[PDB]
């Protein structure tokens, strides 16, 4: 028996359960699928793995976790178990996302980003500009209906606004090619302007009130009470299941931003526990999940985009794939370095402080954020 930790729900989870059943018949090895909230998995795995207390595999982890997990020694290197043919068919950025210390540390499976997802019952065609979006979102907001909602306190969801206002990524690239964790790009003027726009989404434009977290916004879109959400393809399974007719579009560039809006690109991949007492079967099962056919099936059940070149071309005309193909080129991959784990907390703390009150000193909040991150890295 091998165990799988997953953050999947809905149709995505049902796919994973089916593949687990199928592997028990084309294997004889029992697969237990264990649900774990996304925000709890990394700590559970890093701390539990070396104690014999973590699952045999995680389907899936985001690539920003790779450096920290690899340094904790908890990831099985997977390059020795895979062919060049398999590797050649993978998109370069997906390979790079799961490469650390010059080694492939998981099997890259799906690509994702946030985007403007609009319910076509309220919005027939995507707003062409910020001003058109703003006017629409305010119009469609009333007593029980919302024009626009999103996980406003979340640093990942807000990165696109940080990019618009001038952050290429989280960290500057140094000397020739490698990120320097000592040089943040999300503080200073960029950070102050991003945080003011995010404040304005509540206190000026009156779009996103107090209390709105992932579940509030996601719940609202599924229910059909919400015109527009900023969310990613992980949410599409439940939107397809609730029969919402959605479109995918880039988010408008915030007013005052010198650069276009562009989100983080995330790669989800399967990782094997370096302390698995059943690596052979764990590895074989992982490999079953990332065949072209299974990657396509997962997209159809939900919506995350295959990192298989082959599988992607196959879905070239799928609406979800075509939609995200116009969004991904605007974005930047998350860093996968260990230090990324230190940034999210103070970054998200800064945003929550900014949006808590109208009178929040954005200048000092950003200064303190930068100070807290420098301290956590050193």
Ligand X SMILES: OC[C@H]1O[C@H](O[C@H]2[C@H](O)[C@@H](O)[C@@H](O[C@H]3[C@H](O)[C@@H](O)[C@@H](O)O[C@@H]3CO)O[C@@H]2CO)[C@H](O)[C@@H](O)[C@@H]1O
Q: Would you give the binding string for ligand X spanning residues 248-287, x where CB under 6 A is met? A: ------------------x---------------------
Least distance to ligand X, CB of residue 173, Å: 20
Which segment (60-68, 101-109, 191-199, 359-367) binds ligand X by CB under 6 A? 60-68
CB of 264 to ligand X, least distance (A): 7
Residue 344 CB, nearest approach to ligand X (Å): 4
How far apart CA 337 and CA 176 sit, in angstroms, is 16
Task: Compare residues 155 and 160 and give the one whose CB is closer to ligand X.
Answer: 155
- Smallest distance, Å, CB 7 to ligand X? 4
Q: CB 293 → ligand X: shortest distance, Å?
A: 21
Q: Which listed residue (86, 130, 203, 214) binds ligand X by CB under 6 A?
A: 214
Binding mask 218-237 for ligand X (x = CB under 6 A): --------------x-x---
Interface of this chain with ligand X, residues 64 to 93, rule: CB under 6 A: 64-65
Q: How far apart are CA 152 and CA 146, in angstroms?
A: 15
**Which of 81, 130, 205, 344 forms a contact with ligand X (CB under 6 A)?**
344
8 touches ligand X by CB under 6 A: yes
Q: Is there a contact between 170 and 184 (Cβ–Cβ < 8 Å)?
A: yes
Count CB neighbours of 52 within 10 A: 10
**Contact between 108 and ligand X (CB under 6 A)?**
no
CA gyration radius for the chain? 21
Cα dihedral 326, 291, 41, 62 sign: negative
* Beta sheet of 115-119, edge-to-edge order: 146-149, 226-231, 115-119, 246-249
| Burial profile 352-376: b = 16 or more Cβ within 10 angstroms, e = fewer | ebbbeeeebebeebbbbbbebbeee
Q: Which is nearer to ligand X, 67 or 254 (CB)?
A: 67
Helices (H), the chain: 10-25, 38-48, 66-71, 84-88, 92-97, 130-140, 155-165, 188-203, 214-223, 236-241, 279-289, 292-301, 309-314, 319-325, 340-356, 362-377
Q: Which residues in the 277-336 window bind ligand X by CB under 6 A?
A: none
CA distance 169 to 160: 10
CB of 70 to ligand X, least distance (A): 14
Q: Are 229 and 117 in contact (CB under 8 A)?
A: yes
Residue 38 contacts ligand X per CB under 6 A = yes
Number of residues that bind ligand X (CB under 6 A): 16
Tokens 């959605």, residue?
A: 246
DSSP class per residue in 150-200: --TT-HHHHHHHHHHHT-SSSEEEETTTEEEEEEESSSHHHHHHHHHHHHH
Q: Residues 137 to 156: which contact ligand X by CB under 6 A? A: 154-156
Q: Which residue has the tokens 């060049």?
A: 84
Q: Closest CB to ligand X among 12 and 141?
A: 12
Question: In the bound complex, what is the minimum distance in angstroms from residue 112's beta carbon to ligand X?
Answer: 6
Residue 214's SS3 state is: helix
> Which residue from 2, 7, 250, 274 is in contact with ligand X, where contact means CB under 6 A?
7
Q: Is 160 in the site for ligand X (CB under 6 A)?
A: no
Please say which residue, 136 or 152, places its beta carbon nearer to ligand X. 152
Binding residues vs ligand X (CB under 6 A): 7-8, 38, 62, 64-65, 112, 154-156, 214, 232, 234, 266, 344, 348
């Amino acid at each position: 028996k091998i165990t799988v930790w997953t953050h999947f729900g809905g149709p995505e989870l049902e796919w994973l359960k089916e593949q687990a059943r199928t592997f028990e018949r084309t294997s004889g090895t029992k697969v237990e699928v264990v649900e774990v909230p996304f925000a709890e998995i990394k700590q559970k795995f890093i701390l539990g793995a070396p104690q014999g207390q973590a699952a045999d595999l995680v389907v899936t982890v985001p690539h920003d976790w790779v450096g920290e997990m690899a340094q904790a020694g908890v990831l099985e290197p997977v390059g020795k178990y895979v062919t060049q043919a398999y590797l050649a068919d993978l998109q370069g950025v997906a390979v790079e996302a799961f490469t650390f210390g010059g080694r492939l540390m998981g099997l890259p499976a799906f690509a994702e980003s946030v985007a403007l997802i609009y319910n076509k019952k309220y919005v027939k065609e995507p707003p062409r500009t910020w001003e058109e979006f703003l006017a629409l979102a305010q119009k469609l907001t009333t007593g029980a209906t919302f024009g626009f909602l999103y996980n406003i306190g979340d640093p990942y969801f807000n990165f696109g606004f940080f990019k618009a206002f001038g952050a290429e990524n989280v960290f500057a690239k140094d000397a020739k090619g490698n990120l320097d964790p000592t040089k943040l790009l999300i503080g200073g003027e960029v950070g102050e302007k991003a945080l003011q726009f995010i404040k304005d989404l509540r206190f000026k434009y009156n779009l996103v009130p107090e209390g709105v977290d992932y579940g509030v916004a996601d719940g609202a879109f599924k229910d059909g009470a919400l015109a527009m959400i900023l969310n990613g393809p992980w949410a599409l399974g439940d939107y397809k299941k609730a029969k919402v007719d959605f479109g995918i579009a880039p988010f408008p560039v915030p007013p005052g931003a010198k650069n276009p809006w562009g989100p983080f690109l995330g790669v989800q991949g399967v990782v094997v526990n370096a302390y698995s007492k059943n690596k052979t079967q764990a590895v074989n099962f992982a490999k079953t999940l990332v065949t072209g056919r299974n990657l396509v099936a997962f997209n159809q059940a939900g919506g995350r985009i295959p990192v298989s070149k082959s599988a992607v071309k196959q879905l070239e005309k799928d609406p979800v794939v075509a939609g995200f193909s116009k969004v991904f080129p605007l974005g930047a991959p998350m860093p996968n370095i260990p230090e990324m784990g230190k940034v999210w907390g103070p970054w998200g703390n800064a945003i929550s402080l900014a949006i808590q009150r109208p009178d929040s000193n954005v200048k000092k909040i950003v200064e303190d954020m930068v100070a807290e991150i420098k301290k956590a890295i050193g």
